[PDB]
RNA sequence: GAUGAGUAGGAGGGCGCGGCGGUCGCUGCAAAACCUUGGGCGCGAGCCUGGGCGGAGCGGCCGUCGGUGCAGAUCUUGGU
RNA sequence: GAUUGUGGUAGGCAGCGCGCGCCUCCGGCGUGCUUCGGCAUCUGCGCGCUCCGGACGCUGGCCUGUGGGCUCCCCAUUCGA
RNA sequence: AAUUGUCGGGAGGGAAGCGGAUGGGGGCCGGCGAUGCGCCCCGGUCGGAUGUGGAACGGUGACGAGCCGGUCCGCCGAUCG
């Protein structure tokens, strides 16, 4: 966002290539966002990966329980190739959670989405474990 | 330590005495006198620090809603005045519907402990809900019956074969009950016979 | 039944937001909405109300 | 210059309870009702005892 | 560890100041609430004593008039309670306008009304559409307690606390439900303000029904002035 | 997946609003049409006649559009589209579009099983 | 917090059809169309989906355009 | 007796008990005002209770069954039309 | 699609169809309806400091200094997860 994120949001909230809309524009309308740097894939100014200078990106790496945690560099906004500071974590979930907290909240990067980042990390870790060892429980009991 | 209530309740939530009389009885004047014309100040109780809960293994994607506090606490189930120890009860439901049994005591859960006696009508020591029972005016002495060791836990399922210990306990309990029953003539037949409604019998008119 | 005009509902229409699609004007509207809410200033309220007005209702000044 | 932020304005409407039935609401609206009830009950008890 | 940014420090400091001022305001409010509770207790006691003394004085005056052999004319009622008994269909313009001015827009709505020549002449025009009388202390107390709703910013708020009354009528010294009841019953200096603050009462259909709403109460119907007999109707309607 | 919804689903009416006289004339379809005739008893709301829909029948907003299983529907056309529900598996369920082939449906089902995302029609084309 | 009638008529928000500029997708491991006491969503216009048939294309979304929505017209053509 | 639990970060508001004094404990003992009954006159803290800022708790049946559900279909019946 | 034949189900005292409520029968539905969670013991795998070096890099500051910081790799201890 070489221009202010508020302006970027004012422009892109109406339409963008990452916006997914379904079931019309009535009460049935469902909206989501596809950009990889949106923790909750939600079409909102808070989580938008296009209208924020500081953005958190959490996904699964190719192999070996490697989780990619990337942060958008505040000064390299005009350099897409080097816009993301990446870190591939292969250690335990505890260490991954500590690293995510340190890189998201302890430095006042984006404290408002610390919970979202932790939840996304937990979901990615669970997905990787299930992809490795197959489904073993239905997760239907409350 | 005061051994009697200072303010008896005329009704629920209203005391018999006013604030001035309560002051006089509680003796706040005495405490002020002894402390030097000023009430003693007591420091607030120190809260216990929360335990060092280990970090969670998972982080939910949604914030579960915590229910609001409910200030109402259930009270013990009330026992109808028509039901007293030794009262004869009529069962209106279940496999023993219509049977006449003897009431022994009310358990902690609120259910009623009853006995046939087992020999007279085949009804053992059992729990019956008060809502499915009719209390009659017939009373039998039960002072000689000891059921102290029997409580709500006696009937708890351990989860087909009845232990001999329960049979022995039933016999021991029923010996005194039958001995007391024998005093009243025809009470044996009354307890051995079930209750039924015949032609032109109106429950709303029967007194019981 | 209740003896009310139109069920007690209003029948007057006033602007509650700009009809324009100018993003800069929208940002100004957000700014002055916040100012009006958190300051209760009559000047800010007047500015916010005038930000909604149409072109002919915002005449130029020589 | 902003005024202090407010977080306790969106309180749920308190359910209306008839003071004529439950005592606590009656006392909250009018504390003297407690004294009135106490005096009335005591006077009735005294009259019954005398009779 | 990580140095705290100046923006965070400033926000925390201002939050601390706001919390401190809020705590001070809460303490002051608690103290004032204690004093207000004491005051309203004393005022309610005084009002109850006043009502009892008034009843005793009326009885004594009647008895002494009989003893002297003359007649005692009771003071004319200063307060009326009016209940609409007809629907909104096929209304004449004058009747509809008068009912709006009396704030009776729905069948079985009730309102208090101070007795005046102007108000009485207004009510005389709509007599067939309403029934009214002289409310009791019990009637007024029960109406305000069970169905009393106050008007705050043109909104209808239930009188679940004395603060609702204080917010609107505090300037006039009315800060409690008992104060409101006393003002209404005695038609005090601020009766107009208190009555306007009171939202029109939405009464249920009569528990025992009506006799005939198409006839005056004098002929055996329901319309018109039924004086002291409005109280039993209020019992059945509340 | 444990649905987040807790309030019971209440339907004010479960019957369809059928067009008047669609039973009588074949050419008149069932899809609702409001009568505009001057004398129409249905338009006038004569009792014992066909009922007309109105906003009063509106579903409670908390339970609106919720399927009986307690989740909300989202149509997915590929496994890439499936991942959008990774952080909403307790509120949203995925339904595979009718035109997806069996080969892609298998991959979508496997990915949804990995992601703990409910599929409403996971047995189709099997 | 209050409130809910509507012909003629006005307006708002939405549903549906066919193109164009973009964007995101589906399809011989079976598209469109059609069929179905399969199922579900929406107050509703409608929409999503199971199964069948069919055997080559089609859809969602943002703008924008139009020869764009039928029960009537002794309506037109064809069929019964 | 009947209908019903809308909300979900609050121990709030109101009223009241036990300890902070003693005795001989269905109660009694201090200062003021009383209509001689009584009184929000002294009424402060800590811990608690309640008709107190919208329902909680226990038990049972059943879970591949001749079970449960249904907005689907064909019918019958009462009312309407 | 109108319309028609056949088989199967059903109904029928001078229309049929239709709105509302149940019921009989049929049809359909397994996200139709769960079996997990916490604390311990045994066994199997994978990693384990605030120490010491290397690779690339970030927050802030001023896309300087300074301060702070995470990821990965190599070792001495630690013997935990
Ligand atoms: K048709
Ligand atoms: K309408
Ligand atoms: K397209
Ligand atoms: K279909
Ligand atoms: K278009
Ligand atoms: K109840
Ligand atoms: Mg009303
Ligand atoms: Mg007339
Ligand atoms: Mg064309
Ligand atoms: Mg055909």
Automatic annotation (TrEMBL), chain A:
One of its GO terms (molecular function) is structural constituent of ribosome. Keywords: Ribonucleoprotein, Ribosomal protein. One of its GO terms (biological process) is translation. GO terms for cellular component: cytosolic large ribosomal subunit. InterPro entries: Ribosomal_eL28, Ribosomal_eL28/Mak16. Pfam families: Ribosomal_L28e. Gene3D superfamilies: 3.30.390.110. It comes from the Eukaryota. Residues 7-127 form the Ribosomal eL28/Mak16 domain. The keyword Heme does not apply. The keyword Heme does not apply. Belongs to the eukaryotic ribosomal protein eL28 family. PANTHER family: 60S RIBOSOMAL PROTEIN L28. This is 60S ribosomal protein L28-1. It comes from Nicotiana tabacum (Common tobacco). The gene is LOC107824985.
UniProtKB/TrEMBL annotation, chain C:
It comes from the Eukaryota. Belongs to the eukaryotic ribosomal protein eL18 family. This is 60S ribosomal protein L18-2. The gene is LOC107829149. The chain holds residues 2 to 63 of 187 of the full protein.
TrEMBL record, chain E:
Belongs to the universal ribosomal protein uL30 family. It comes from Nicotiana tabacum. The keyword Transcription regulation does not apply. The keyword Ribonucleoprotein applies. This is 60S ribosomal protein L7-4. PROSITE patterns: RIBOSOMAL_L30. One of its GO terms (biological process) is maturation of LSU-rRNA from tricistronic rRNA transcript (SSU-rRNA, 5.8S rRNA, LSU-rRNA). Keywords: Metal-binding, Ribonucleoprotein, Ribosomal protein. GO terms for molecular function: RNA binding; structural constituent of ribosome. One of its GO terms (cellular component) is cytosolic large ribosomal subunit.
From TrEMBL, chain F:
One of its GO terms (molecular function) is structural constituent of ribosome. InterPro entries: Ribosomal_eL32, Ribosomal_eL32_CS, Ribosomal_eL32_sf. One of its GO terms (biological process) is translation. CDD domains: Ribosomal_L32_L32e. Keywords: Ribonucleoprotein, Ribosomal protein. The keyword Ribonucleoprotein applies. Pfam families: Ribosomal_L32e. GO terms for cellular component: cytosolic large ribosomal subunit. Belongs to the eukaryotic ribosomal protein eL32 family. PANTHER family: 60S RIBOSOMAL PROTEIN L32 AND DNA-DIRECTED RNA POLYMERASE II, SUBUNIT N, 60S RIBOSOMAL PROTEIN L32-1. This is 60S ribosomal protein L32-1.
């Amino acid at each position: 966002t070489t221009v202010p994120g508020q302006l970027v949001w004012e422009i892109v909230k109406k339409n963008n290539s990452f916006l997914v809309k379904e079931f019309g524009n009535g009460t049935a309308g469902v909206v989501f966002s596809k950009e990889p740097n949106n923790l909750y894939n939600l079409h909102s100014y808070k989580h938008s990966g296009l209208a924020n200078k500081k953005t958190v990106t959490i996904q699964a790496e190719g192999k070996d329980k490697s989780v990619l945690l990337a942060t958008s560099k505040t000064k390299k906004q005009n350099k897409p190739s080097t816009l993301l500071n990446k870190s591939v974590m292969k250690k335990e979930f505890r260490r991954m959670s500590k690293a995510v907290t340190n890189q998201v909240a302890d430095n006042y990067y984006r404290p408002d989405l610390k919970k979202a980042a932790l939840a996304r990390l937990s979901a990615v870790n669970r997905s990787l474990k299930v992809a490795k060892s197959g489904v073993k429980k239905k997760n239907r009991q409350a | 330590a005061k051994k009697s209530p200072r303010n008896p309740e005329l009704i629920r939530g209203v005391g018999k005495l006013s604030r001035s009389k309560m002051y006089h009885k509680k003796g706040l004047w005495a405490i002020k006198k002894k402390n030097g014309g000023s009430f003693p100040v007591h420091k607030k109780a120190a809260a216990v620090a929360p335990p060092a809960v280990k970090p969670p293994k998972f982080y939910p994607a949604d914030d579960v809603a915590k229910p609001l506090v409910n200030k109402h606490k259930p009270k013990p189930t009330k026992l109808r005045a028509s039901i007293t120890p030794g009262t004869v009860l009529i069962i209106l439901a279940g496999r023993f519907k219509g049977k006449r049994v003897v009431f022994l005591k009310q358990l902690k859960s609120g259910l009623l402990l009853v006995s046939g006696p087992f020999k007279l009508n085949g009804v053992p020591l059992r729990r019956v809900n008060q809502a499915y029972v009719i209390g009659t005016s017939t009373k039998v002495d039960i002072s000689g019956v000891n059921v102290e060791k029997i409580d709500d836990k006696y009937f708890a399922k351990q989860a087909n074969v009845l232990p001999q210990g329960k049979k022995d306990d039933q016999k021991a309990v029923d010996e005194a009950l039958i001995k007391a029953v024998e005093c009243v003539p025809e009470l044996k037949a009354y307890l051995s016979a079930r209750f039924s409604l015949k032609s032109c019998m109106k429950p709303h008119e029967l007194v019981f | 039944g209740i003896d009310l005009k139109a069920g007690g509902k209003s029948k007057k229409t006033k602007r509650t937001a700009p009809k324009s699609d100018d993003v800069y004007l929208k940002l100004l509207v957000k700014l002055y909405r916040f100012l009006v809410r958190r300051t209760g200033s009559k000047f800010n309220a007047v500015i916010l109300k005038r930000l909604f007005m149409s072109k002919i209702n915002k005449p130029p000044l020589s | 210059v902003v005024r202090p932020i407010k977080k306790d304005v969106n309180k749920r409407a308190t359910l209306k309870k008839n003071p004529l039935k439950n005592l606590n609401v009656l006392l909250k609206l009018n504390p003297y009702a407690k004294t009135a009830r106490r005096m009335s009950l005591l006077a009735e008890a005294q009259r019954v005892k005398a009779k | 560890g990580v140095l705290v940014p100046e923006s965070v420090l400033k926000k925390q400091k201002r939050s601390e100041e706001w919390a401190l001022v809020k705590k001070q305001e809460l303490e002051a409010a608690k103290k004032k609430n204690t004093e207000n509770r004491k005051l309203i207790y004393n005022r309610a006691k005084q009002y109850a004593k006043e009502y009892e003394a008034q009843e005793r004085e009326l009885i004594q005056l009647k008895r002494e008039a009989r003893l002297k052999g003359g007649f005692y004319v009771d003071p004319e009622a200063k307060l009326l309670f009016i209940i609409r008994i007809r629907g909104i269909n096929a209304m004449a313009p004058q009747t509809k306008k008068i009912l709006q001015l009396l704030r009776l827009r729905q069948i079985f709505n009730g309102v208090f009304l101070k007795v005046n020549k102007a108000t009485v002449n207004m009510l005389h025009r709509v007599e067939p559409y309403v029934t009214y009388g002289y409310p009791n202390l019990k009637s007024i107390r029960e109406l305000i307690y069970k169905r009393g709703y106050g008007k705050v910013e043109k909104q209808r708020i239930a009188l679940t606390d004395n603060s609702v009354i204080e917010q609107v009528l505090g300037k006039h010294g009315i800060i409690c439900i008992e104060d409101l009841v006393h003002e209404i019953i005695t038609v005090g200096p601020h009766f107009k303000e208190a009555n306007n603050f009171l939202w029109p009462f939405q009464l249920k259909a009569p528990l025992g029904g009506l006799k005939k709403k198409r006839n005056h109460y004098v002929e055996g119907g329901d319309a018109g002035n039924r004086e002291n007999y409005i109280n039993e109707l209020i019992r059945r309607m509340n | 997946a444990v649905p987040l919804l807790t309030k019971k689903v209440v339907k004010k009416r479960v019957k369809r609003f059928i067009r008047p006289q669609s039973d009588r004339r074949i050419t008149v379809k069932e899809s609702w049409r409001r009568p505009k005739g001057i004398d129409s008893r249905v338009r006038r709301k004569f009792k014992g006649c066909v009922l007309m829909p109105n906003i009063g029948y509106g579903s409670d907003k908390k339970t609106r559009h919720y399927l009986p299983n307690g989740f909300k529907k989202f149509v997915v056309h590929n496994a890439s589209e499936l991942e959008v529900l990774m952080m909403h598996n307790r509120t949203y369920c995925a339904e595979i579009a009718h035109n997806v082939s069996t080969r892609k449906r298998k991959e979508i089902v496997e990915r949804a099983a990995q992601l703990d995302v409910v599929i409403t029609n996971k047995l189709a084309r099997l």
